């Protein structure tokens, strides 16, 4: 009769489990982000850990809006970014996002919105995140490609029908854009497309594809090399095929015990694919929150 709302406690429970698993202190602006999460409707929450050798960076949480209210979802997400940026010790520079959104932006061409954080004990190295997926939008695909410095060799990876765009805003004023072209299982398993992958990507980067239903590549001037994203169909497959170190294994062993998706994402570098032990890896786990009449 009325629109349903998922209780904030259910969403914050999932985030709270992650905070407790990895000893996350209330870094700024985690409390503001939890209030933001409380105000949302149906969503998917993604928690992740970034492993660098024996160092775990676990204060990484993204929210994906499940409904299609893209204009209003972007604007509540940006309102979070700007409120967090109000504190005098923080400097956020949203110029690259202002450039992307400039003019008469067509919000009917948006497909997904995500808002998130990656917080560090060193306030300056902390960042806020915004993701916008657009489809069939030539003008704004071109803007994003220009902001991302897409050269040939990289342009071949980008699709025309859809483009997942990420914005990173560091709390010291630095900012970066990232493009994430993706292929679905049905596409990368087709011999035409695989043979084009064989030219731009080593066999090592193609190795996990049988385990996945989605494959993506992160392209950003901020990256040392392209970042490979694998959406594993079965979280239980991970430790059989990837030789991760003890620090990453602690993250994964905890998430093997959690309620949530049966799938997971792993992100790695191609060089870290031609090597014995994986010591630089991001692991992403999620849980969906859906109600009866959202």
Q: CB-based burial of residue 203 (10 Å sphere; 0-12 exposed, 13-18 middle, 19+ buried)?
A: exposed
The only residue of 9, 23, 224, 259 in contact with ligand GST, by rule CB under 6 A:
224
> Is 178 one of the annotated binding-site residues?
yes
Closest CB to ligand GST among residues 45, 107:
45
- CB neighbour class for 58 (10 Å; exposed up to 12, middle 13-18, buried from 19): buried
Among candidates 108, 101, 152, which has minimal Cα distance to 130? 101
How far, rounded to the nearest angstrom, does the alpha carbon of residue 124 sit from its chain's CA centroid? Answer: 20
In angstroms, the CA 216 to CA 228 distance is 6
The answer to whether residue 62 forms part of the interface with Mg ion (CB under 5 A) is no
Residue list 141-180, contact with Mg ion (CB under 5 A): 178
- By a kind-dependent CB cut-off of 5 to 8 A, residue 51 interacts, out of Mg ion, ligand GST, none, with none
Nearest-angstrom CA–CA distance, 67 and 294: 8
Residues 26-85 that bind ligand GST (CB under 6 A): 50
HSE-up of 157 (CA within 13 Å, CB side)?
25
Binding pattern for the stretch 232-271 against ligand GST, x by CB under 6 A and - elsewhere: -----------------------------------xxx--
Q: Which does 77 bind (CB under 5 to 8 A by kind): Mg ion, ligand GST, none?
A: none
Helices 30-38 and 70-85: crossing angle, nearest 10°? Answer: 160
Nearer CB in complex with ligand GST: 35/272: 272
**Can you say which residues are annotated as belonging to the binding site for Mg(2+)?**
178
Binding site for Mg ion (CB under 5 A): 178
Binding site for ligand GST (CB under 6 A): 50, 118, 166, 178, 218, 223-225, 227, 267-269, 272, 280, 282
């Amino acid at each position: 009769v009325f629109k349903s709302t998922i209780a904030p406690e259910e969403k914050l429970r999932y985030i709270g489990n992650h905070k407790q698993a990895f000893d996350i202190e209330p870094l700024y602006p985690l409390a503001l982000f939890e209030e933001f999460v409380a105000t949302t409707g149906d969503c998917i929450i993604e928690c992740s850990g970034k492993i660098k050798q024996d160092q775990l960076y676990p204060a990484r949480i993204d929210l994906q809006f499940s409904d299609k209210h893209h204009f209003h979802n972007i604007h509540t997400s940006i309102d979070f970014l700007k409120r967090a940026a109000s504190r005098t010790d923080v400097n956020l520079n949203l110029d690259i996002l202002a450039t992307f959104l400039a003019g008469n932006f067509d919000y009917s061409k948006v497909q997904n919105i995500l808002a998130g954080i990656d917080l560090r004990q060193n306030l300056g190295e902390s960042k806020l995140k915004l993701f916008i997926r657009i489809g069939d939008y030539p003008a704004k695909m071109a803007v994003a490609k220009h902001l991302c410095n897409i050269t040939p060799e990289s342009e071949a990876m980008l699709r025309s029908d859809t483009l997942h765009i990420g914005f990173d805003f560091y709390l010291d004023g630095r900012s970066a854009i990232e493009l994430y072209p993706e292929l679905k299982k049905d596409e990368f398993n087709h011999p035409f497309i695989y043979n084009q992958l064989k030219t731009i990507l080593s066999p090592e980067a193609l190795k996990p594809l049988p385990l996945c239903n989605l494959f993506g590549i992160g392209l950003s001037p901020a990256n040392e090399a392209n970042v490979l994203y694998y959406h594993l169909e079965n979280i239980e497959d991970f430790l059989s095929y990837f030789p991760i170190n003890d620090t990453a294994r602690r993250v994964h062993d905890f998430y093997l015990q959690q309620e949530g998706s049966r799938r997971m994402w792993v992100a790695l570098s191609e060089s870290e694919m031609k090597a014995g032990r994986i010591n630089n890896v991001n692991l992403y786990y999620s849980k969906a929150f859906t109600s009866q009449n959202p």
